[PDB]
Amino acid sequence: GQLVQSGAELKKPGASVKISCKTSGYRFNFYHINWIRQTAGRGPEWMGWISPYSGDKNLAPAFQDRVIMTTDTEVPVTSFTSTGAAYMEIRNLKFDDTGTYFCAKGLLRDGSSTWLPYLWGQGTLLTVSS
Amino acid sequence: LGFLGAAGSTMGAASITLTVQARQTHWGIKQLQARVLAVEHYLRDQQLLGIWGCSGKLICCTNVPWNSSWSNKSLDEIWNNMTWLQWDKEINNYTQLIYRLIEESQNQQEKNEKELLELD
Amino acid sequence: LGFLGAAGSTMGAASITLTVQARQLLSHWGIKQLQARVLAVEHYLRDQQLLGIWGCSGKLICCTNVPWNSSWSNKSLDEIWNNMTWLQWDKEINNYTQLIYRLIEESQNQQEKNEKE
Amino acid sequence: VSLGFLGAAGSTMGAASITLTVQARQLLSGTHWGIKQLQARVLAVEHYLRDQQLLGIWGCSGKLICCTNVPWNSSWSNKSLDEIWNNMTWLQWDKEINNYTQLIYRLIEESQNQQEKNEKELLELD
Amino acid sequence: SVLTQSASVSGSLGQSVTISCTGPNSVCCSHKSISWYQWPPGRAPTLIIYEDNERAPGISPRFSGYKSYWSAYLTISDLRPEDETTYYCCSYTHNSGCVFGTGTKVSVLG
Ligand SMILES: *[C@@H]1O[C@H](CO)[C@@H](O[C@@H]2O[C@H](CO)[C@@H](O[C@@H]3O[C@H](CO[C@H]4O[C@H](CO[C@H]5O[C@H](CO)[C@@H](O)[C@H](O)[C@@H]5O)[C@@H](O)[C@H](O[C@H]5O[C@H](CO)[C@@H](O)[C@H](O)[C@@H]5O)[C@@H]4O)[C@@H](O)[C@H](O[C@H]4O[C@H](CO)[C@@H](O)[C@H](O)[C@@H]4O[C@H]4O[C@H](CO)[C@@H](O)[C@H](O)[C@@H]4O)[C@@H]3O)[C@H](O)[C@H]2NC(C)=O)[C@H](O)[C@H]1NC(C)=O
Ligand SMILES: *[C@@H]1O[C@H](CO)[C@@H](O[C@@H]2O[C@H](CO)[C@@H](O[C@@H]3O[C@H](CO[C@H]4O[C@H](CO)[C@@H](O)[C@H](O[C@H]5O[C@H](CO)[C@@H](O)[C@H](O)[C@@H]5O)[C@@H]4O)[C@@H](O)[C@H](O[C@H]4O[C@H](CO)[C@@H](O)[C@H](O)[C@@H]4O)[C@@H]3O)[C@H](O)[C@H]2NC(C)=O)[C@H](O)[C@H]1NC(C)=O
Ligand SMILES: *[C@@H]1O[C@H](CO[C@@H]2O[C@@H](C)[C@@H](O)[C@@H](O)[C@@H]2O)[C@@H](O[C@@H]2O[C@H](CO)[C@@H](O[C@@H]3O[C@H](CO)[C@@H](O)[C@H](O)[C@@H]3O)[C@H](O)[C@H]2NC(C)=O)[C@H](O)[C@H]1NC(C)=O
Ligand SMILES: *[C@@H]1O[C@H](CO)[C@@H](O[C@@H]2O[C@H](CO)[C@@H](O[C@@H]3O[C@H](CO)[C@@H](O)[C@H](O)[C@@H]3O)[C@H](O)[C@H]2NC(C)=O)[C@H](O)[C@H]1NC(C)=O
Ligand SMILES: *[C@@H]1O[C@H](CO)[C@@H](O)[C@H](O)[C@H]1NC(C)=O
Ligand SMILES: *[C@@H]1O[C@H](CO)[C@@H](O)[C@H](O)[C@H]1NC(C)=O
Ligand SMILES: *[C@@H]1O[C@H](CO)[C@@H](O)[C@H](O)[C@H]1NC(C)=O
Ligand SMILES: *[C@@H]1O[C@H](CO)[C@@H](O)[C@H](O)[C@H]1NC(C)=O
């Protein structure tokens, strides 16, 4: 199970940015995709998750007005393996949005903690400058 | 859901549907073979349940301890992260061993119950 | 006594002989003979599958949680058990038999859900 | 450590009771040729079900060992339990009571039917 | 960051190390579960504990968690040099997102 993210990008204030998250080695529809942000002045913060199966989303109020999540239709490899990708777009970037962005695979089906991240991508940097 | 409708669901989720799935000249010759075949498979499974003492129940607990070599997974890893199809592959080389252990435990249980009754 | 010797007896009296009829349900031309042998097996198993579905397997007499609907019959237990044969009884409820069977199956399904807890 | 199928046949009846599951399992598992195979498959099913038909009637179904309420008749055998359980094979025992096997079976069936009749009545009184 | 943790916890190698996590009683820990992560700087994190009681798959037996109404804590048995990293607690429920605390650093004495 592996996740791969779009590389670092420099943006002007007010610009939107889209970050891809390609996945492989596990069934894409079986687990939630969690977007997590880290900023030096805030520490790690949850940005919300999207189910690849239903398209259902759960975002923090902090990001509900700025962040849009979508996923690709999965393409099967084996009966228990598939590939696909998640995307997130952040609208109206602020300097406070600078930091490291991570894509992570959900832990399990039908548990009490289904959406919690288990496998993480390396993460990539977002920078904002005049 | 329906017959095998739970197959893609987790093992724990599937447990609610067991009740549903518990159910179920040339051409005439093939139908005869089809009828015999259907009977053999029904009885094959019932034969094992009757020996195990599990007959009449969809879910039957036994006294055989789980061996970690059959699987080292925790219950949450098994019941909530797997389908029954995936699980069947993991224990495919141990399934017959487990069946024999269930049978041995049943015979010892009944022998002990007989002895308890003899003392009363 | 004997096979079906109780058939003309009262339903209550007949119950003493249930084992008499429960037994002997089992036991080119080679095909014809096999079809009959398979048929005897299928009918035996058909009844046993229903008992397994109803939770009544292994019992000659099995109580259920399904209430009697007075529209099926308004006759008292004394009238039914002591003044009727089973042959007559089946005729009176011949049109409700499939309904009753479905209700028993539904009741078992609810019981299984409770036993799981 | 299993003796294998019928490996207990030469053992005493008490020892043999350890291996009942070995025998119970594989009762179902163990063109001119095509018809003979079909007959073999049907026969094995009839054989298996014949014994199960009796157990279901006796209320013994689902059990390897089933105690009943029918008293032993000394005319069937005058042997003590040690003379039977520790000194005989099941093969010898079946011959000793071969004439009474059907008699015993009918008595078990009668006792089961009366038992269930009584169990119903006990519930009706509650 | 309503949850708070000690700025750091120190101990010698082979020593038990315990990290507390607390917050408002509406947040921790009644009707809530706590997860615990390693989060080295510049790197993706590793999850150690789920439901404040169980080790995640692939996690060594030396790690364990404990729960109480007022607070929760992570204990590291047999401290090793590999464990000298930043840790975070997180509050969660089945119907809500992850809330990360202030975090703490584990320091090896010697
Ligand atoms: C195919 O495979 C996929 C693989 O994921 C299967 O999906 C998985 O299905 C399970 C359920 O079987 C999900 O777990 C449960 O998730 C809820 C939270 O759900 C979030 O999404 C909800 C919408 O999505 C679900 O429903 C749609 C249909 O409507 C499905 O298509 C989806 O697949 C999902 O199943 C959404 O409604 C929830 O809303 C809540 O949160 C929002 C946040 O913004 C609020 O607004 C809402 O008001 C609301 O609060 C939510 O966003 C968890 O709540 C479940 O936890 C309960 O059940 C656990 C298991 O029993 C238990 O351990 C927990 O403690 C908890 O228990 C409580 O609920 C039980 C159920 O009612 C009670 O019985 C219990 O007593 C107690 O009250 C649970 O974790 C997986 O998340 C989902 N996975 C993914 C990736 O989506 C899919 O089902 C398979 N398909 C088939 C046909 O098999
Ligand atoms: C085929 O047919 C044969 C013959 O009938 C069957 O053999 C019989 O098997 C039963 C199985 O239980 C035997 O019963 C037991 O008998 C022993 C008798 O002790 C002798 O045998 C021992 C065998 O290991 C041997 O060790 C003994 O001798 C040594 O040790 C003593 C003591 O230190 C020493 O003094 C000697 O010098 C030797 O060094 C001795 O020769 C008895 O000990 C057993 O007791 C236990 O089990 C019973 C039953 O559960 C229990 O009640 C006791 O409390 C105790 O736990 C047991 O009674 C029987 O003796 C065998 N008969 C013969 C003639 O050998 C064989 O099993 C059949 N095969 C099949 C496949 O059915
Ligand atoms: C839910 O299940 C997945 C997948 O597990 C796989 O499928 C299951 C149905 C079972 O058959 C498993 O036996 C089978 O592996 C779990 O994810 C898997 O976790 C393992 C690690 O425990 C991953 O392998 C590792 O990958 C890392 C990558 O850096 C290596 O360093 C390790 O050496 C090791 O190879 C594995 O890739 C991953 N999934 C798959 C498809 O491989 C998942 O953890 C589980 N969820 C829970 C809560 O148990
Ligand atoms: C064939 O039909 C006849 C007529 O219905 C049956 O006769 C009835 O048989 C029962 C016993 O099986 C008799 O019951 C007894 O009645 C006396 C009083 O007479 C009572 O004291 C006993 O406690 C018991 O109830 C019944 O009287 C009798 N009816 C008549 C009109 O004589 C007969 O039994 C049927 N045979 C079979 C095998 O069912
Ligand atoms: C598990 O199986 C192995 C097989 O060699 C056996 O040695 C071991 O004792 C078993 N464990 C338990 C607890 O039975
Ligand atoms: C079972 O045996 C097969 C080979 O027959 C092997 O491919 C498979 O991995 C084995 N399963 C386990 C769990 O070891
Ligand atoms: C014992 O058998 C005799 C016949 O040999 C029979 O007359 C007698 O009633 C039997 N006893 C019991 C209790 O069945
Ligand atoms: C069974 O009955 C026959 C006579 O019909 C007799 O020869 C034989 O010895 C009897 N068997 C036993 C075990 O008593």
PDB file of N, CA and C in Angstrom, chain B residues 7-69:
ATOM      1  N   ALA B   7     -21.069 -10.651   0.304  1.00  0.00           N
ATOM      2  CA  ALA B   7     -19.739 -11.160  -0.026  1.00  0.00           C
ATOM      3  C   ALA B   7     -18.659 -10.083  -0.047  1.00  0.00           C
ATOM      4  N   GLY B   8     -18.999  -8.866  -0.448  1.00  0.00           N
ATOM      5  CA  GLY B   8     -18.004  -7.797  -0.472  1.00  0.00           C
ATOM      6  C   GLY B   8     -17.878  -7.065   0.868  1.00  0.00           C
ATOM      7  N   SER B   9     -18.781  -7.357   1.797  1.00  0.00           N
ATOM      8  CA  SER B   9     -18.794  -6.699   3.099  1.00  0.00           C
ATOM      9  C   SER B   9     -17.788  -7.361   4.022  1.00  0.00           C
ATOM     10  N   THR B  10     -17.519  -6.746   5.165  1.00  0.00           N
ATOM     11  CA  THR B  10     -16.566  -7.339   6.086  1.00  0.00           C
ATOM     12  C   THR B  10     -17.151  -8.570   6.741  1.00  0.00           C
ATOM     13  N   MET B  11     -16.286  -9.397   7.313  1.00  0.00           N
ATOM     14  CA  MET B  11     -16.734 -10.627   7.940  1.00  0.00           C
ATOM     15  C   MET B  11     -17.737 -10.372   9.046  1.00  0.00           C
ATOM     16  N   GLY B  12     -17.513  -9.320   9.830  1.00  0.00           N
ATOM     17  CA  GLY B  12     -18.439  -8.992  10.900  1.00  0.00           C
ATOM     18  C   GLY B  12     -19.783  -8.540  10.354  1.00  0.00           C
ATOM     19  N   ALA B  13     -19.760  -7.694   9.323  1.00  0.00           N
ATOM     20  CA  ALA B  13     -20.999  -7.185   8.744  1.00  0.00           C
ATOM     21  C   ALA B  13     -21.834  -8.309   8.146  1.00  0.00           C
ATOM     22  N   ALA B  14     -21.152  -9.284   7.560  1.00  0.00           N
ATOM     23  CA  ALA B  14     -21.791 -10.407   6.896  1.00  0.00           C
ATOM     24  C   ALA B  14     -22.563 -11.300   7.857  1.00  0.00           C
ATOM     25  N   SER B  15     -22.221 -11.256   9.146  1.00  0.00           N
ATOM     26  CA  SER B  15     -22.796 -12.186  10.110  1.00  0.00           C
ATOM     27  C   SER B  15     -24.305 -12.017  10.278  1.00  0.00           C
ATOM     28  N   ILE B  16     -24.832 -10.854   9.911  1.00  0.00           N
ATOM     29  CA  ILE B  16     -26.271 -10.628   9.990  1.00  0.00           C
ATOM     30  C   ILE B  16     -27.041 -11.371   8.886  1.00  0.00           C
ATOM     31  N   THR B  17     -26.361 -11.700   7.781  1.00  0.00           N
ATOM     32  CA  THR B  17     -27.022 -12.254   6.597  1.00  0.00           C
ATOM     33  C   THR B  17     -26.932 -13.770   6.504  1.00  0.00           C
ATOM     34  N   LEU B  18     -26.334 -14.408   7.498  1.00  0.00           N
ATOM     35  CA  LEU B  18     -26.113 -15.848   7.424  1.00  0.00           C
ATOM     36  C   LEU B  18     -27.434 -16.586   7.290  1.00  0.00           C
ATOM     37  N   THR B  19     -28.479 -16.027   7.887  1.00  0.00           N
ATOM     38  CA  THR B  19     -29.806 -16.615   7.840  1.00  0.00           C
ATOM     39  C   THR B  19     -30.324 -16.677   6.412  1.00  0.00           C
ATOM     40  N   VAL B  20     -30.062 -15.619   5.653  1.00  0.00           N
ATOM     41  CA  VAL B  20     -30.505 -15.531   4.271  1.00  0.00           C
ATOM     42  C   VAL B  20     -29.799 -16.553   3.401  1.00  0.00           C
ATOM     43  N   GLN B  21     -28.492 -16.678   3.614  1.00  0.00           N
ATOM     44  CA  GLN B  21     -27.645 -17.540   2.804  1.00  0.00           C
ATOM     45  C   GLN B  21     -27.692 -18.999   3.234  1.00  0.00           C
ATOM     46  N   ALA B  22     -28.196 -19.252   4.438  1.00  0.00           N
ATOM     47  CA  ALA B  22     -28.377 -20.616   4.925  1.00  0.00           C
ATOM     48  C   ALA B  22     -29.366 -21.364   4.045  1.00  0.00           C
ATOM     49  N   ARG B  23     -30.300 -20.617   3.469  1.00  0.00           N
ATOM     50  CA  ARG B  23     -31.315 -21.158   2.584  1.00  0.00           C
ATOM     51  C   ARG B  23     -30.700 -21.439   1.222  1.00  0.00           C
ATOM     52  N   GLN B  24     -31.263 -22.397   0.492  1.00  0.00           N
ATOM     53  CA  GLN B  24     -30.768 -22.765  -0.837  1.00  0.00           C
ATOM     54  C   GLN B  24     -29.421 -23.472  -0.726  1.00  0.00           C
ATOM     55  N   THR B  25     -35.311 -36.986 -23.368  1.00  0.00           N
ATOM     56  CA  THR B  25     -34.631 -37.903 -22.459  1.00  0.00           C
ATOM     57  C   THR B  25     -33.292 -37.342 -22.004  1.00  0.00           C
ATOM     58  N   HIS B  26     -32.590 -36.681 -22.917  1.00  0.00           N
ATOM     59  CA  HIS B  26     -31.267 -36.148 -22.615  1.00  0.00           C
ATOM     60  C   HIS B  26     -31.290 -35.187 -21.440  1.00  0.00           C
ATOM     61  N   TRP B  27     -32.231 -34.252 -21.455  1.00  0.00           N
ATOM     62  CA  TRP B  27     -32.299 -33.282 -20.378  1.00  0.00           C
ATOM     63  C   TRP B  27     -32.698 -33.931 -19.062  1.00  0.00           C
ATOM     64  N   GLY B  28     -33.532 -34.968 -19.134  1.00  0.00           N
ATOM     65  CA  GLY B  28     -34.010 -35.626 -17.926  1.00  0.00           C
ATOM     66  C   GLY B  28     -32.876 -36.302 -17.172  1.00  0.00           C
ATOM     67  N   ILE B  29     -31.918 -36.847 -17.913  1.00  0.00           N
ATOM     68  CA  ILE B  29     -30.767 -37.479 -17.289  1.00  0.00           C
ATOM     69  C   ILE B  29     -29.914 -36.448 -16.575  1.00  0.00           C
ATOM     70  N   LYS B  30     -29.709 -35.301 -17.213  1.00  0.00           N
ATOM     71  CA  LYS B  30     -28.911 -34.258 -16.588  1.00  0.00           C
ATOM     72  C   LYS B  30     -29.593 -33.715 -15.340  1.00  0.00           C
ATOM     73  N   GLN B  31     -30.923 -33.631 -15.366  1.00  0.00           N
ATOM     74  CA  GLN B  31     -31.653 -33.185 -14.187  1.00  0.00           C
ATOM     75  C   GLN B  31     -31.503 -34.181 -13.048  1.00  0.00           C
ATOM     76  N   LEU B  32     -31.443 -35.471 -13.369  1.00  0.00           N
ATOM     77  CA  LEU B  32     -31.250 -36.463 -12.321  1.00  0.00           C
ATOM     78  C   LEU B  32     -29.898 -36.272 -11.659  1.00  0.00           C
ATOM     79  N   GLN B  33     -28.867 -36.032 -12.463  1.00  0.00           N
ATOM     80  CA  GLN B  33     -27.546 -35.802 -11.903  1.00  0.00           C
ATOM     81  C   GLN B  33     -27.515 -34.516 -11.088  1.00  0.00           C
ATOM     82  N   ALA B  34     -28.227 -33.495 -11.564  1.00  0.00           N
ATOM     83  CA  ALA B  34     -28.306 -32.220 -10.864  1.00  0.00           C
ATOM     84  C   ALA B  34     -28.976 -32.366  -9.507  1.00  0.00           C
ATOM     85  N   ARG B  35     -30.013 -33.195  -9.446  1.00  0.00           N
ATOM     86  CA  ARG B  35     -30.735 -33.402  -8.202  1.00  0.00           C
ATOM     87  C   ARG B  35     -29.889 -34.143  -7.184  1.00  0.00           C
ATOM     88  N   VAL B  36     -29.141 -35.141  -7.644  1.00  0.00           N
ATOM     89  CA  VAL B  36     -28.267 -35.878  -6.745  1.00  0.00           C
ATOM     90  C   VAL B  36     -27.155 -34.989  -6.231  1.00  0.00           C
ATOM     91  N   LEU B  37     -26.588 -34.186  -7.121  1.00  0.00           N
ATOM     92  CA  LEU B  37     -25.495 -33.309  -6.748  1.00  0.00           C
ATOM     93  C   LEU B  37     -25.925 -32.301  -5.691  1.00  0.00           C
ATOM     94  N   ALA B  38     -27.113 -31.724  -5.862  1.00  0.00           N
ATOM     95  CA  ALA B  38     -27.608 -30.756  -4.894  1.00  0.00           C
ATOM     96  C   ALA B  38     -27.781 -31.392  -3.520  1.00  0.00           C
ATOM     97  N   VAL B  39     -28.247 -32.640  -3.495  1.00  0.00           N
ATOM     98  CA  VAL B  39     -28.417 -33.353  -2.237  1.00  0.00           C
ATOM     99  C   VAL B  39     -27.092 -33.648  -1.554  1.00  0.00           C
ATOM    100  N   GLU B  40     -26.095 -34.064  -2.326  1.00  0.00           N
ATOM    101  CA  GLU B  40     -24.810 -34.395  -1.727  1.00  0.00           C
ATOM    102  C   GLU B  40     -24.171 -33.198  -1.051  1.00  0.00           C
ATOM    103  N   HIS B  41     -24.279 -32.028  -1.668  1.00  0.00           N
ATOM    104  CA  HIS B  41     -23.670 -30.845  -1.083  1.00  0.00           C
ATOM    105  C   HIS B  41     -24.406 -30.363   0.152  1.00  0.00           C
ATOM    106  N   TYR B  42     -25.729 -30.463   0.145  1.00  0.00           N
ATOM    107  CA  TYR B  42     -26.477 -30.102   1.335  1.00  0.00           C
ATOM    108  C   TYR B  42     -26.069 -30.980   2.504  1.00  0.00           C
ATOM    109  N   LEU B  43     -26.042 -32.287   2.272  1.00  0.00           N
ATOM    110  CA  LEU B  43     -25.737 -33.223   3.336  1.00  0.00           C
ATOM    111  C   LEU B  43     -24.287 -33.166   3.771  1.00  0.00           C
ATOM    112  N   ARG B  44     -23.386 -32.840   2.853  1.00  0.00           N
ATOM    113  CA  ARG B  44     -21.979 -32.767   3.211  1.00  0.00           C
ATOM    114  C   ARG B  44     -21.763 -31.770   4.336  1.00  0.00           C
ATOM    115  N   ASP B  45     -22.373 -30.595   4.211  1.00  0.00           N
ATOM    116  CA  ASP B  45     -22.206 -29.578   5.234  1.00  0.00           C
ATOM    117  C   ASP B  45     -22.929 -29.949   6.523  1.00  0.00           C
ATOM    118  N   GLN B  46     -24.096 -30.577   6.397  1.00  0.00           N
ATOM    119  CA  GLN B  46     -24.845 -30.977   7.581  1.00  0.00           C
ATOM    120  C   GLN B  46     -24.140 -32.097   8.328  1.00  0.00           C
ATOM    121  N   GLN B  47     -23.428 -32.949   7.594  1.00  0.00           N
ATOM    122  CA  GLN B  47     -22.688 -34.032   8.221  1.00  0.00           C
ATOM    123  C   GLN B  47     -21.643 -33.470   9.160  1.00  0.00           C
ATOM    124  N   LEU B  48     -20.934 -32.443   8.710  1.00  0.00           N
ATOM    125  CA  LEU B  48     -19.923 -31.848   9.560  1.00  0.00           C
ATOM    126  C   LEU B  48     -20.535 -31.163  10.769  1.00  0.00           C
ATOM    127  N   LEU B  49     -21.641 -30.456  10.572  1.00  0.00           N
ATOM    128  CA  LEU B  49     -22.252 -29.762  11.696  1.00  0.00           C
ATOM    129  C   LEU B  49     -22.769 -30.740  12.742  1.00  0.00           C
ATOM    130  N   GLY B  50     -23.338 -31.854  12.290  1.00  0.00           N
ATOM    131  CA  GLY B  50     -23.868 -32.841  13.220  1.00  0.00           C
ATOM    132  C   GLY B  50     -22.766 -33.472  14.055  1.00  0.00           C
ATOM    133  N   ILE B  51     -21.610 -33.695  13.439  1.00  0.00           N
ATOM    134  CA  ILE B  51     -20.470 -34.251  14.150  1.00  0.00           C
ATOM    135  C   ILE B  51     -19.913 -33.247  15.144  1.00  0.00           C
ATOM    136  N   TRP B  52     -19.874 -31.978  14.744  1.00  0.00           N
ATOM    137  CA  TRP B  52     -19.348 -30.899  15.578  1.00  0.00           C
ATOM    138  C   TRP B  52     -20.282 -30.525  16.725  1.00  0.00           C
ATOM    139  N   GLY B  53     -21.550 -30.926  16.627  1.00  0.00           N
ATOM    140  CA  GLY B  53     -22.535 -30.582  17.649  1.00  0.00           C
ATOM    141  C   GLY B  53     -23.123 -29.196  17.407  1.00  0.00           C
ATOM    142  N   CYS B  54     -22.827 -28.641  16.239  1.00  0.00           N
ATOM    143  CA  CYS B  54     -23.242 -27.296  15.865  1.00  0.00           C
ATOM    144  C   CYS B  54     -24.572 -27.286  15.122  1.00  0.00           C
ATOM    145  N   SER B  55     -25.137 -28.462  14.897  1.00  0.00           N
ATOM    146  CA  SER B  55     -26.346 -28.566  14.097  1.00  0.00           C
ATOM    147  C   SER B  55     -27.481 -27.753  14.692  1.00  0.00           C
ATOM    148  N   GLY B  56     -28.230 -27.093  13.816  1.00  0.00           N
ATOM    149  CA  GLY B  56     -29.368 -26.274  14.210  1.00  0.00           C
ATOM    150  C   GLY B  56     -28.988 -24.822  14.499  1.00  0.00           C
ATOM    151  N   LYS B  57     -27.694 -24.503  14.467  1.00  0.00           N
ATOM    152  CA  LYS B  57     -27.258 -23.133  14.722  1.00  0.00           C
ATOM    153  C   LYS B  57     -26.463 -22.564  13.556  1.00  0.00           C
ATOM    154  N   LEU B  58     -26.687 -21.286  13.262  1.00  0.00           N
ATOM    155  CA  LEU B  58     -25.918 -20.591  12.237  1.00  0.00           C
ATOM    156  C   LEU B  58     -24.530 -20.226  12.744  1.00  0.00           C
ATOM    157  N   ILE B  59     -24.446 -19.927  14.038  1.00  0.00           N
ATOM    158  CA  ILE B  59     -23.181 -19.596  14.679  1.00  0.00           C
ATOM    159  C   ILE B  59     -22.949 -20.515  15.864  1.00  0.00           C
ATOM    160  N   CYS B  60     -21.837 -21.230  15.844  1.00  0.00           N
ATOM    161  CA  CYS B  60     -21.543 -22.212  16.871  1.00  0.00           C
ATOM    162  C   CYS B  60     -20.164 -22.066  17.494  1.00  0.00           C
ATOM    163  N   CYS B  61     -20.137 -21.650  18.753  1.00  0.00           N
ATOM    164  CA  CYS B  61     -18.884 -21.535  19.488  1.00  0.00           C
ATOM    165  C   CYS B  61     -18.370 -22.917  19.871  1.00  0.00           C
ATOM    166  N   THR B  62     -17.051 -23.091  19.870  1.00  0.00           N
ATOM    167  CA  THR B  62     -16.450 -24.361  20.265  1.00  0.00           C
ATOM    168  C   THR B  62     -15.473 -24.146  21.410  1.00  0.00           C
ATOM    169  N   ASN B  63     -14.895 -25.239  21.898  1.00  0.00           N
ATOM    170  CA  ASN B  63     -13.896 -25.182  22.957  1.00  0.00           C
ATOM    171  C   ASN B  63     -12.467 -25.272  22.431  1.00  0.00           C
ATOM    172  N   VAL B  64     -12.289 -25.184  21.114  1.00  0.00           N
ATOM    173  CA  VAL B  64     -10.945 -25.265  20.552  1.00  0.00           C
ATOM    174  C   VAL B  64     -10.283 -23.889  20.576  1.00  0.00           C
ATOM    175  N   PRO B  65      -9.120 -23.723  21.218  1.00  0.00           N
ATOM    176  CA  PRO B  65      -8.398 -22.472  21.299  1.00  0.00           C
ATOM    177  C   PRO B  65      -7.845 -22.105  19.938  1.00  0.00           C
ATOM    178  N   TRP B  66      -7.783 -20.817  19.641  1.00  0.00           N
ATOM    179  CA  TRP B  66      -7.171 -20.390  18.394  1.00  0.00           C
ATOM    180  C   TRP B  66      -5.659 -20.510  18.463  1.00  0.00           C
ATOM    181  N   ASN B  67      -5.072 -21.087  17.430  1.00  0.00           N
ATOM    182  CA  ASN B  67      -3.625 -21.147  17.296  1.00  0.00           C
ATOM    183  C   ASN B  67      -3.108 -19.959  16.500  1.00  0.00           C
ATOM    184  N   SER B  68      -2.193 -19.209  17.088  1.00  0.00           N
ATOM    185  CA  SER B  68      -1.677 -18.017  16.436  1.00  0.00           C
ATOM    186  C   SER B  68      -0.948 -18.329  15.129  1.00  0.00           C
ATOM    187  N   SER B  69      -0.504 -19.571  14.940  1.00  0.00           N
ATOM    188  CA  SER B  69       0.151 -19.905  13.682  1.00  0.00           C
ATOM    189  C   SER B  69      -0.846 -19.976  12.526  1.00  0.00           C
TER     190      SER B  69
END
